[PDB]
Amino acid sequence: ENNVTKVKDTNIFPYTGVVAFKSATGFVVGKNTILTNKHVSKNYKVGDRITAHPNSDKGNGGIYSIKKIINYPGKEDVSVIQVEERAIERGPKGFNFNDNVTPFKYAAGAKAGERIKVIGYPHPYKNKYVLYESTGPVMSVEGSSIVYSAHTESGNSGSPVLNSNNELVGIHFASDVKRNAYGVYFTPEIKKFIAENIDK
Amino acid sequence: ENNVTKVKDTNIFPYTGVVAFKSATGFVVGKNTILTNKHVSKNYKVGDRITAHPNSDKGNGGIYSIKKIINYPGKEDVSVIQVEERAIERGPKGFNFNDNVTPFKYAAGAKAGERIKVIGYPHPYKYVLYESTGPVMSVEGSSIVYSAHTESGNSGSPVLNSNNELVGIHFASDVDNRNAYGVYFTPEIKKFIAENIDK
């Protein structure tokens, strides 16, 4: 499927769960904690900034500094990023990261044919910090792999893949040249790693 | 079929997706990333060079250093090769690999009867690109069979449909209505390739 639409208000759920890197996406999984891809976080360091749910230059939920980066020891393209709880620049709800974002909750599962949404900042260059939502069916779910046919671009690296009830079914990491997109499915092993690394 | 013809212009699409090893072929699948056969990459190492879309004389899309070799875990003769983004020798569109080449897109599928082309270097003499045409004989799981004439230099060749979309990668022939054998891109193999394209 190729159904990609601009998000008009990024300051409501589910959009408040998404964060922007310079040319990639991530999302909130718990207190002061974001998920993105290793291929994204390899270019960031402690003290670099992330912005919560920006809408171009129209408003955002704050600018936050990275305090810790932890990569999944396994093969899957998953990296945990913790931020300082107190914003560099406040969001509308004040300086606290957690007041300005909404973590996603895992779905019970996913299955071929169900419809998903990939939400993120697709454009590496143009449409800076413009959030889009891209829809399509799940093609397969096998182990730590989820495949879905939804249009994505390179800035979608680190995007949440949500089901129709805005529950988390995967994290996006790649797409085919010019029908399928590939996400990591949250197996118990990956979930255990993420849970151990959510800021206490 | 035995319909093999020299590629007139090697600097246009789809030929800009093809790269040359010493006496074998591979092709671009993504950022800084090429596919070839395991039986090709086993003779190469990190730090060896590949040439993007060379012509018969001296012109090419650059010379690039190998940075990673990742074989597919499975029976199929498929290897992922990443290159340094910055050319050892620049192409006409500069030092960036990705500015000088054009990745292939997967076909929706392939069926017996349709006509394909196998593009590569069947004669190891100067790199000279050829195109070899023929019908698809069968498709079964990760195996695509086609009657198109090939030589050993075609190892790692893209097999393309009439719209220049990727239907498999060449790995073998029989020793003209002889059959040749490619790996068809099953979901499992696509996933591995997507996991191992440079990002």
| Domain range annotation of chain A | 1-10+105-200, 11-104
Instruction: Domain A11-104: state its class.
Output: mainly beta
| Residue (of B162, B66, B184, B166) closest to B106 by Cα position | B166
CB-facing half-sphere around the CA of A8: CA atoms within 13 A? 0
Per residue, the 3-state secondary structure of B69-111, as one string, reads EEECCCCCCCEEEEECCEEEEEECCEEEHHHHCCCCCECCCCC
Smallest Cβ–Cβ distance between B197 and the set A37, A147, A174 belongs to A174
Instruction: Indicate which technique resolved this structure.
Output: X-ray
Q: How far does Cα B175 stand from its chain's mean position?
A: 21
Active site residue A157: yes
What is d(CA A118, CA A128) in angstroms, rounded to the nearest whole number? 17
Tokens coding B100:
């000088």
Angle among Cα A175, B73, B85 to the nearest 5 degrees reads: 50
Q: Which two tokens stand for residue A179?
A: 């029908």
Q: Hey, which residues does B89 pair with through a beta bridge?
A: B63
DSSP string, A41-90: HTT--TT-EEEES--TTS--S-EEEEEEEEE-SSSS--EEEEE-SEEEEE
First-to-last C-alpha distance (Å) of chain A: 40
The reply to whether residue A174 touches residue B29, judged by beta carbons under 8 angstroms, is no
Helix (H) or strand (E) holding B190: helix B187-196
Both structure tokens of B127: 């790199």
Answer whether B71's CB lies under 8 Å from B182's CB. Answer: no
- Asked if B50 and B19 count as a contact pair (C-beta separation under 8 A), the reply is yes
The reply to whether residue A147 touches residue B187, judged by beta carbons under 8 angstroms, is yes
B104 interaction partners in chain A (CB closer than 8 Å): 177
Is-contact B20 B50, C-beta < 8 A?
yes
Interface of B with A (CB under 8 A): 29-30, 103-106, 108, 187, 190-191, 194-195, 197, 199
State how beta strands A145-148 and A94-96 pair: unpaired
User: Under 8 Å CB-to-CB from A109, ≥6 apart: which residues?
Assistant: A141, A169
Query: What tokens does B189 get?
Result: 């193999």
Q: Which alpha helices (H) appear in chain A, and where do they start and end? A: 38-41, 188-196
Work out the burial of residue A114: count CB atoms within 10 Å of its CB; fewer than 13 is exposed, 13-18 middle, 19 or more buried.
Answer: middle
Retrieve residue B88's tokens: 């050892």
Please list, in sequence order, all residues whose beta carbon lies within 8 angstroms of the beta carbon of residue B8, skipping any fewer than 6 positions away. none
Which H or E element spans position B187?
helix B187-196
| Partners of residue A57 on adjacent β-strands | none
Residues in chain B preceding a C-to-N separation beyond 2.5 angstroms (breaks): 125, 175
CA distances from B43 to A47, A132, B22, B23, B171 (A): 44, 45, 10, 11, 15
CA distance B185 to B166: 9
**Cβ distance B100 to B94 under 8 Å?**
yes
Q: Which residue of chain A is at minimal alpha-carbon distance from B107?
A: A179
Minimum distance, in Å, between the CA of residue B199 and any CA atom of chain A: 6
CA nearest to A183, candidates A131, A139, A125: A139
State the Cα–Cα distance between residues A137 and B187, nearest whole angstrom: 15
Please tell me which residue in A77, A134, A151, A172 is annotated as part of the active site.
A77
Helical (H) or strand (E) element with B65: strand B63-71
Rounded CA separation B105/B158 (Å): 11
- How far CA B59 is from CA of A135, B45, B56, B64, B118, in Å, comes to 44, 25, 8, 14, 22
Resolution in units of Å: 1.8
Return d(Cα B182, Cα B172) in angstroms, integer.
Answer: 7
Catalytic residue among A39, A65, A140, A199: A39
Please judge whether A179 and B108 are an interchain contact, meaning their C-beta atoms are less than 8 angstroms apart: yes
A9 token code pair: 């208000």
* Element containing residue A142 per DSSP (H, E): strand A132-142
**Are A91 and A15 in contact, with CB atoms under 8 Å apart?**
no
CATH of region A1-10+105-200 = 2.40.10.10
Nearest chain B Cα distance for residue A35, angstroms: 17
**Pick among 3.30.450.40, 3.30.470.20, 3.40.50.720, 2.40.10.10: CATH of B1-10+105-199:** 2.40.10.10
Q: Are the CB atoms for B155 and B169 separated by under 8 Å?
A: no
Pick A174's closest partner by Cβ from B105, B106, B194: B194
* Residue indicated by tokens 């895992």: A106
Chain B residues near residue A176 by CB distance under 8 angstroms: 105-106, 190, 194
Would you name the residues of B annotated as active-site residues? 39, 77, 155
Catalytic residue flag (residue A199): no
Asked if B103's CB is within 8 angstroms of A176's CB, the reply is no
CA distance B36 to A68: 39
CA B52 centroid distance within chain: 11
Cβ-based contacts under 8 A for chains A and B: 36
Which residues are within 8 A (CB) of A105 and not within 5 positions of it... i.e. 6 or more apart? A167, A168
Q: Chain B contacts of A175, Cβ < 8 Å?
A: 194
C-alpha pair distances (Å), B102 with each of A111, A180, B51 = 34, 19, 14
Phi first, then psi, for residue B192 (nearest 5°) are -60, -45
User: For testing the chain B interface, which of A25, A177, A184 should be mutated: the one with the most B CBs within 10 Å?
Assistant: A177
Query: What phi, psi does B39 have (nearest 5°)?
Result: -70, -15
The pair of structure tokens assigned to A11 is 């300051």
Find, in chain B, the residue whose alpha carbon is nearest to that of A37: B199
Give the burial class of A172: count Cβ atoms within 10 A of its Cβ; 0-12 exposed, 13-18 middle, 19 or more buried: buried
The Cα of B58 is separated from the nearest Cα of chain A by a number of Å equal to: 30
